[PDB]
Design a protein around this ligand. Structure first.
Ligand SMILES: [Zn+2]
Lengths: 645, 214, 107, 159, 81, 96, 97, 214, 91, 49
RNA sequence: UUAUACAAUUAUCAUAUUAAAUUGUUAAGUGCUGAUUUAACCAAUAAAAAUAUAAAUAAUUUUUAUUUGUUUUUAAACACCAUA
């Protein structure tokens, strides 16, 4: 994309030079004219006179005995840049929250600013009904007002549930129909209204309804009247947001291509969105393999484009860059990104730390780096999440170090005292099992985690893998009694025993020559194979051999090993000879994909405080006994205690 | 880690078996769970530990020691308007209706005040007196007329509370220029033990006023 | 067991207790349990608890036999021997240090 | 969610009726739902004559009963399709299937004393009984009835 | 304290136990019911009239009335059971 | 309780006392606001502080924060985040 | 000091009693769940009889069901859900009889 | 009735009494009882029951049906029981169940402060969403106001009882100014913080764990 | 308490917004000439010119009166913007 | 501040101090530092001298 | 000395009377459910912080009733006028 940016910049400079023939910015900024118009409006004499501060008492008169000048004149405030500390108040006589109602602004609708109304009006009717009122009183509704109405409907759509959004989107569609077909008051449907419609489509999904219909209509109408219908940067931002929401990568990349090819300046939001699209494409490729090299270049290219167009980058941009870098497997690059964010003044996010940890999941070393990240979360204002702990334990498991996982647990997770997820327990025990030098403390920690998880329940059901790795750890440590103990827990959960599981128990017996080693218990483990109807294994043969060496000879064990050899030889003769015990994989999923226990749960404290929805609290019914109100002497038992009728 | 218990319900320990209601009673459910949790126990009132047993031998005879089955004892339930106010109101209404038993809430002050009424001879007796939620007062009548003529709280409204001084107690004892053992004023002292004005004046102390009765 | 599962005959607590009584070894009882789970046979929660208690006792007896076996060779009980005497079998679905649990089921 | 519909359709040609019902079923299936059953209910004469989209009263109408499983949102989508359909003169939607009528309004003690699965699992004919259906038919179904009904037509048969 | 519900029972004894004076009638004998109503209202006693024509449990109540009164005569009055 | 920290090296502490009305036998609790002094900027809005009078430090500042009895953990964490110690209120005094 | 220590110890004892009573309740809920399993399991058995109409079989079922009251048929016509025999149609939805 | 409804939502067989007929069977046998007595595959004891103590351990299917119960049925039946067919009420219960899984310290726990704050706020979002589509609902306006106040109380208690959970819940959901003083005129007087003292939360942070109090 | 009217006896809408917007802007009403071309063969049954109305952005099938060609276009493009038959404009 | 809660807060403080003395158990021999000086003497201001 | 306000014809004003209720456009039902009828499908809505002594533990908003505006080829009507 940087090549397109350079070509567009040089062409724009050449056009400027031709115009000068008939500092030469290399691009066009669609926001500048609107910002300048707002500033000029603010500086206009009428605006200043209307929003002049309240009149002083010395400016009104003396001592306020005159009926007309006893108190100041009504002062009109601007909700966007108020010239007063607090716009509202709830004193007894100067209450003003009721006068933010829509009905009071209905009196002045030919002058009204619909976006400001939608933002700062309280008891505001449904967007369709509001549009009906506007058209009923026949105000010359412009494109910005139509966009404001569609934005109101879009806010409602976003607040709605995911599974209750179609009807609100259809209401938006009906409003668009009304605007396009109505003429008796001049109603103008413009580029920003089309952008808001595309954005409603994106919010509710509906790629086919957003792209194919409304983006196509916008393009057709632009081509019809290019001078009177210009696709600005906001339209492309909404289009590319639709692309991101729908998962379409080529369309979003081509949209940013169009923005660059046009000599207008892209915005940081759509730049982050293109970064997210590149990250999606990189993850898609990695899945397919499990030309990416030019994709990596084209992806880092928009990061360089941030500097090309002088756009300041925010926490969202940093998170998108880290996600893209991690999708392209560049842990050093994501570390560079963290350092850049710290050098600049932009807050990091728990999601940024999620990506920071998930990027180093593969590279060896970095054991103390994770500890440093966990330790420095606290000074930075953040607190670790179960997702972050899961990522750290994923690193511990992949690098197969048990000491780091044990330290992480002991020094951070017990203090957090949050519920452990089945994935967290699985990864912890799996790291402690694959660890080269497991210690007994790992038995305590793993069994405590298992019991705690059982005490709170879950809905992922990784019981058999967690107990499999637990038996593997008991095998590597020689805790045969602990293995038998976990055997009853597996029985109680009612899950089938496994050849791998009994192999691990047998290996536990073999390694437990000193810690409760028993040839009769070897016979018991052989009986497990004979009676439970499970195919023995080549690793089963290995483990029975090791146990035989560790304790001695026994007729039952010798018969078992000979039948094992005969059966596996016969199966090899039949075909498919090599069969060992497959490893339980280490779940390696992105932080944005591993299950997160949280929903949208969207609310607005400003609306809660200001009662935008007319929220009503019934008064306590004369429950304000105040000393200035009381009139009467009070003495024990009352003035006339115990009066008979 | 360590989580602290905030409310009295959490501190006293509460299953919260019901879904979300935090203020659900739970007394019965806990009582029957504890009951089936057991028969060396009699239906006499229990005490959680031995040293809590009464000093009087005859009362020790009625009381038994039970480890954790001493809790949740009781049959009746609890039937603004602080417990003393409501106690006085219920007793007055029942006396005017010429009833026998009045189920009235059992708090420290209400229970001590009822005991003082018994001592002075205004109530024939009690039922379920060891309940910590409510207890029944067995009212006494003599020749069709009720022994209690008037009973009213110190806080005639439900709001304002008072603090009687020893001068106030002597005032009550010599009210209206007589020696006054006839109408009984009850006060809860600084030791959380409820006494009448006779004993308060004998001991040179006062307390928070509870009610008057005669 | 498949006949019982298809006929939908519900095994009584007494029948399950007597059945698991006739077993001698922990592995034998485990095989019986997994046969019952493989077939879809019905029973009560009471019978389930009795079955699990039977498995629990089988494990305790097996470990006691192992420690006795070791006792003659070593001439004295081991620290694990005495600690097993006191603790008992480890985590189980019906421990004896918690004798209050099981009263709602058992009658 | 278990939903049921009663459609009153103007009696056009069989091909047109099949096209309408096929479009309805395709909406149901493309909206991620299942149809428990469809039953043509014959052509009857309603007591009140519905006007066609041409505002002509139709004396005769075919009745179709649909039973299906759909989420609420897509159920609403297909519901609007059915209501705005050309042929459908009326579409009665049963909301009372999972929970029997009257307990939401009837008695507070009994509001949470019902089993929704009981009604969810059974078909609409087993929740709303026709005049002909009676527990005798269910007892007959529970009986083998093959060697019981074989002697039914003898006394009349010989005479 | 509870919603109003019209009382119905398949047993004549429930009616006798509930209502002081209860008369069972039909719509085909208006004059007899009018006369009994006249008498009862003249003596100012609360009385409940029940029409058996649309009353559910009609046959149970009718046979019970016939066996208690030893006659088929729908207009019937009951006092103190 | 520390109520405002807009001034440097100064904490505004809201303290309460009791007034007695014999006629109504009432004990009504009033409130008073004090400019306290914390030289190292250690007090955040929402802290329960123990304040002690001393010499005069400024025109209206004759108290100091002897000890913080209960710090505002949420306020400190928000300040770490870079927000305001407590979100500013949306209501206030009328302008007329 | 003694009084405060007794209060703390009483609180801890209450916590232990709560532990025991929770363990006791778990059994009751386990038994109650068992009743649900039996009732719920049986209600699902009867759901196997529901003969859904697969999308592939949809058109065939529609036509076979539309052919229910046509005309000229040997086996008796069924009564509709209202228990009233409706009119017959020769074919293509035209009423004749 | 509210507690009965939510208890039924939480627990499985809480309706069914020991007689195996809940109240609706007694009066309407023809609806509740299964019409056809089928001899098919009467299933055996569920050996997997340990996994689902309460309905919120299985919310990915209709009527909180565990997957182990769906082993043998047909794909059409499974699809009918899938999430997509789930009703709005059961979807809301699944949303509650996610957070119960995240923040419950034991099974059958449904009232812990972290869980309570989340449930009050979920109810508040539900009511506000309803008001979006139907702004003319005065009863819902009143319920929304009450639920917002109670959500504020729950979050305020959570903040001082278990701060880490409060911080996590605030961060996760992009609502940071939820705990916010309404009025400056009263916030100037410590009336926003005096709430903690009056609520008993003023001594509940364990300073040594957040900073050395020397 | 809002009163509704069913447009063409199928679509129930609020009476206010119906009289103001829906009724006067129905395809068979505002542009009957355009309604004539409505492709009644390739176009779903639950959509017909008596309901869809002008301003419908979704494309629909149109049967041309001149060259008898079936083309897909949106109702708003056909009526407001002045859409036409591609084959006719080619000819 | 409501004085009625002083007893409850006293119980809570007692229990918290006991938990602190019981859990961390990390006292030790620490060198005491010179107490320095304080600027907040009571009464009226003092002169330079 | 009222330390008390019986009492109603300046009153001095003013928490909306709620699962039997209110609301429904995108959700139900209806020609406005109340002519018949003490009973009305579905969706939302009934509980859920500490503390009873604790002397502010409450909010500052809402409108189902009636008029009037809004406008109103613009209701067809019906009833009032002769708009509503
Ligand atoms: Zn053409």
């Amino acid at each position: 994309l940087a090549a397109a940016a350079v070509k567009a910049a040089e062409w724009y400079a050449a056009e400027n030079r031709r115009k000068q023939k008939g500092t030469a910015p290399l691009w066009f900024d669609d926001t500048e004219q609107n910002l300048l118009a707002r500033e000029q409006h603010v500086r206009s004499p009428a605006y200043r006179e209307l929003h002049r501060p309240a009149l002083t008492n010395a400016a009104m008169g003396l001592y306020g005995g005159e009926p007309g000048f006893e108190k100041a004149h009504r002062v009109w405030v601007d909700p966007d840049r108020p010239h007063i500390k607090h716009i509202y108040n709830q004193t007894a006589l100067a209450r003003n929250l009721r006068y933010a109602r829509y009905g009071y602004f209905k009196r002045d609708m030919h002058l009204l600013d619909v976006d400001k109304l939608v933002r700062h009006a309280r008891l505001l009717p449904t967007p369709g009904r509001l549009l009906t009122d506007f058209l009923y009183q026949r105000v010359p509704l412009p494109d910005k007002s139509c966009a404001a109405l569609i934005r109101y409907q879009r806010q409602q759509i976003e607040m709605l549930e995911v599974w209750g959004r179609h009807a609100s989107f259809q209401c938006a569609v009906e409003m668009f129909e009304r605007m396009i077909v109505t003429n008796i008051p001049p109603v103008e449907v413009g580029v920003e209204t089309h952008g808001e419609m595309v954005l409603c489509a994106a919010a509710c999904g509906k790629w086919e309804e957003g792209w194919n219909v409304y983006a196509n209509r916008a393009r057709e109408l632009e081509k019809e009247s290019p001078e009177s219908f210009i696709l600005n940067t906001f339209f492309f931002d909404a289009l590319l947001t639709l692309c991101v929401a729908a998962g379409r990568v080529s369309e979003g990349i081509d949209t940013l291509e169009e923005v660059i090819k046009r000599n207008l300046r892209p915005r940081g939001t759509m730049l982050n969105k293109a970064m997210i699209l590149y990250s999606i494409l990189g993850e898609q490729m990695s899945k397919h393999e499990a030309e990416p090299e030019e994709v990596e270049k084209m992806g880092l290219e928009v990061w360089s484009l941030f500097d090309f167009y002088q756009l300041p980058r925010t926490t969202a941009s940093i998170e998108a860059y880290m996600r893209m870098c991690c999708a392209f497997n560049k842990p050093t690059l994501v570390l560079k990104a963290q350092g850049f964010a710290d050098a600049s003044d932009i807050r990091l996010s728990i999601e940024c730390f999620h990506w920071l940890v998930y990027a180093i999941r593969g590279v060896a070393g970095f054991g103390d780096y994770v500890m440093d990240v966990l330790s420095q979360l606290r000074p930075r204002g953040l607190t670790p999440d179960f997702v972050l702990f899961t990522l750290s334990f994923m690193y511990c498991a992949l690098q197969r170090d048990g000491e780091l996982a044990l330290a992480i647990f002991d020094q951070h997770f017990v203090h957090q005292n949050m519920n452990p997820t089945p994935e967290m327990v699985l990864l912890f025990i799996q790291a402690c099992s694959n660890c080269e030098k497991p210690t007994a403390a790992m038995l305590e920690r793993s069994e405590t985690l298992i019991k705690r998880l059982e005490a709170v329940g879950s809905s992922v059901d990784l019981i058999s893998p967690i107990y499999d790795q637990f038996l593997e750890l008991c095998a590597h440590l020689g805790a045969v009694a602990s293995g038998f103990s976990a055997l009853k827990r597996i029985v109680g959960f009612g899950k089938p025993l496994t050849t791998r599981m009994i192999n691990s128990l047998l290996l536990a017996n073999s390694n437990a020559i000193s810690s409760n080693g028993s040839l009769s218990m070897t016979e018991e483990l052989v009986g497990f194979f004979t009676l439970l109807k499970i195919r023995p294994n080549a690793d089963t043969e290995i483990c029975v051999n090791l146990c035989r060496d560790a304790f001695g000879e026994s007729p039952v064990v010798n018969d078992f090993i000979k039948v094992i050899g005969e059966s596996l030889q016969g199966d090899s003769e039949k075909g498919e000879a090599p069969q060992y015990d497959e490893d339980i994989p280490v779940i390696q999923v992105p932080p944005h994909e591993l299950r997160q226990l949280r929903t949208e749960w969207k609310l607005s404290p400003r609306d809660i405080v200001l009662r935008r929805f007319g929220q009503h609290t019934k008064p306590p019914g004369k429950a304000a006994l105040d000393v200035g109100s009381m009139r009467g002497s009070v003495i024990p038992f009352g003035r006339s205690p115990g009066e008979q009728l | 880690g360590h989580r602290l218990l905030h409310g009295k319900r959490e501190r006293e320990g509460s299953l919260f078996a019901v879904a979300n209601d935090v203020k659900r009673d739970e007394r019965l459910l806990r009582q029957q769970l504890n009951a089936l949790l057991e028969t060396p126990l009699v239906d006499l009132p229990g005490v959680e530990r031995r040293r809590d047993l009464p000093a009087d031998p005859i009362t020790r005879l009625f009381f038994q020691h039970k480890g954790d089955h001493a809790l949740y004892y009781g049959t009746y339930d609890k039937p603004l308007y602080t417990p003393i106010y409501d106690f006085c109101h219920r007793i007055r209404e029942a006396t005017e209706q010429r009833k026998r038993f009045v189920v009235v809430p059992s708090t420290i002050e209400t229970r001590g005040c009822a005991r003082v009424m018994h001592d002075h001879g205004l109530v024939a007796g009690f039922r379920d007196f060891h309940n910590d939620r409510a207890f029944a007062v067995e009212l006494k009548y003599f020749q069709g007329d009720s022994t209690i003529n008037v009973i009213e709280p110190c806080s005639y409204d439900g709001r304002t509370e008072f603090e009687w001084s020893p001068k106030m107690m002597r005032r009550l004892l010599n009210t209206h220029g007589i020696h006054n053992r006839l109408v009984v004023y009850i006060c809860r002292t600084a030791d959380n033990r409820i006494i009448d004005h006779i004993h308060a004046v004998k001991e040179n102390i006062g307390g928070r006023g509870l009610m008057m009765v005669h | 067991m498949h006949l019982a599962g298809r006929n939908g005959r519900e095994l009584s607590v007494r029948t399950i207790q007597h059945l698991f009584a006739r077993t001698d070894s922990f592995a034998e009882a485990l095989a019986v349990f997994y046969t019952m789970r493989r077939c879809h046979v019905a029973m009560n929660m009471e019978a389930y608890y009795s079955m699990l208690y039977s498995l629990q006792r089988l494990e305790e007896e097996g470990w006691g036999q192992h420690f006795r076996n070791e006792y003659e060779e070593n001439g004295a009980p081991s620290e694990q021997a005495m600690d097993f005497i006191v603790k008992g079998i480890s985590n189980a679905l019906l421990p004896e240090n918690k004798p209050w649990l099981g009263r709602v089921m058992f009658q | 969610v278990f939903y049921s519909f009663v459609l009153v359709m103007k009696p056009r040609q069989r091909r047109f009726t099949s096209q309408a019902l096929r479009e309805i079923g395709v909406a149901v299936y493309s909206n991620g739902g299942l149809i428990r059953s469809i039953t043509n209910e014959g052509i009857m004469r309603p007591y009140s004559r519905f006007r066609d989209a041409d505002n002509t009263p139709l004396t005769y109408a075919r009745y179709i009963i649909l039973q299906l499983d759909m989420g609420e949102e897509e159920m609403g989508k297909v519901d609007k399709i059915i209501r705005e359909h050309q042929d459908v003169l009326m579409a009665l939607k049963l909301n009372n299937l999972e929970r029997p009528v009257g307990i939401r309004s009837g008695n507070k003690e009994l509001q949470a004393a019902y089993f929704p699965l009981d009604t969810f699992t059974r078909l609409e004919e087993e929740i709303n009984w026709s005049p002909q259906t009676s527990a005798d038919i269910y007892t007959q179904l529970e009986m083998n009835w093959k060697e019981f009904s074989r002697t039914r037509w003898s006394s009349f048969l010989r005479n | 304290a509870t919603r109003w519900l019209p009382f119905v029972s398949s047993d004549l004894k429930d009616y006798l136990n509930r209502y002081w004076a209860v008369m069972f009638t039909v719509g085909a004998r208006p004059i007899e019911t009018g006369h009994i109503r006249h008498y009862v209202s003249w003596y100012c006693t609360r009385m409940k009239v029940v029409l058996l024509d649309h009353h559910v449990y009609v046959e149970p109540l009718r046979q019970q009335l016939q066996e208690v009164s030893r006659t088929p005569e729908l207009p019937l009055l009951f006092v103190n059971k | 309780y520390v109520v405002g920290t807009s001034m440097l090296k100064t904490a505004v502490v809201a303290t309460n006392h009791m007034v007695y009305y014999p006629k109504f036998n009432q004990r009504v609790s009033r409130t008073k606001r004090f400019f306290a002094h914390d030289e190292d900027l250690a007090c955040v809005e929402g802290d329960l502080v123990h304040i002690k009078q001393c010499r005069k430090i400024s025109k209206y500042k004759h108290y100091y924060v002897f000890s913080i009895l209960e710090p505002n953990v949420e306020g400190r964490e928000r300040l770490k985040l870079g927000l305001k110690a407590v979100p500013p209120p949306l209501f206030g005094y009328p302008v007329s | 000091e003694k009084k405060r220590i007794e209060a703390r110890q009483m609180m801890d004892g209450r916590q232990a009693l709560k532990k025991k009573h929770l363990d006791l309740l778990r059994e009751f809920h386990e038994r109650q769940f068992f009743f649900w399993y039996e009732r719920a399991s049986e209600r699902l058995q009867n759901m196997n009889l529901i003969n859904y109409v697969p999308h592939a079989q949809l058109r065939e079922h529609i036509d076979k069901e539309l052919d229910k009251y046509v005309a000229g048929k040997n086996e008796p016509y069924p009564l509709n859900f209202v228990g009233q025999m409706p009119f017959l149609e020769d074919g293509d939805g035209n009423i004749v009889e | 009735p509210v507690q009965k409804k939510r208890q039924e939502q939480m627990l499985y067989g809480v309706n069914i009494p020991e007689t195996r007929q809940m109240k609706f069977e007694e009066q309407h046998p023809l609806l509740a009882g299964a019409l056809r007595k089928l001899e098919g595959q009467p299933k055996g004891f569920p050996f997997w029951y340990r996994k689902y103590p309460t309905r919120r351990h299985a919310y990915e299917y209709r009527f909180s049906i565990p997957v182990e119960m769906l082993d043998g049925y047909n794909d059409d039946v499974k699809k009918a029981l899938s999430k997509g067919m789930m009703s709005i009420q059961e979807k809301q219960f699944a949303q509650e169940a996610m957070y119960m899984e995240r923040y419950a310290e034991h099974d059958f726990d449904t009232t812990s402060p972290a869980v309570l704050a989340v449930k009050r706020a979920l109810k508040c979002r539900v009511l506000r969403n309803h008001l979006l589509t139907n702004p003319h609902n005065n009863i819902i306006k009143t319920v929304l106001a009450n639920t917002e106040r109670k959500l504020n109380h729950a979050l305020r208690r959570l903040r001082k009882v278990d701060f880490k959970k409060y911080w996590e819940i605030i961060r996760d959901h992009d609502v940071q100014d939820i705990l916010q003083p309404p009025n400056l005129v009263t916030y100037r007087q410590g009336s926003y913080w005096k709430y903690d003292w009056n609520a008993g939360l003023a001594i509940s942070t364990n300073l040594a764990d957040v900073m050395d109090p020397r | 308490k809002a009163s509704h009217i069913r447009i063409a006896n199928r679509k129930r809408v609020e009476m206010f917004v119906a009289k103001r917007f829906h009724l006067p802007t129905r395809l068979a009403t505002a542009a009957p000439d355009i309604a004539a071309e409505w492709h009644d063969e390739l176009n779903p049954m639950h959509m017909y010119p008596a309901i869809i109305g002008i301003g419908h952005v979704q494309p629909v099938w149109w049967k041309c009166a001149i060259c008898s060609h079936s083309y897909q276009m949106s109702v708003e493009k056909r009526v407001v913007r002045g859409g036409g038959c591609p084959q006719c404009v080619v000819n | 501040l409501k004085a009625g809660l002083l007893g409850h807060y006293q119980q809570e403080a007692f229990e918290a101090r006991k938990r602190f003395e019981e859990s961390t158990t990390y006292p030790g021999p620490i060198r005491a530092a010179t107490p320095g000086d304080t600027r907040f003497y009571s009464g009226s201001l003092e002169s330079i001298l």
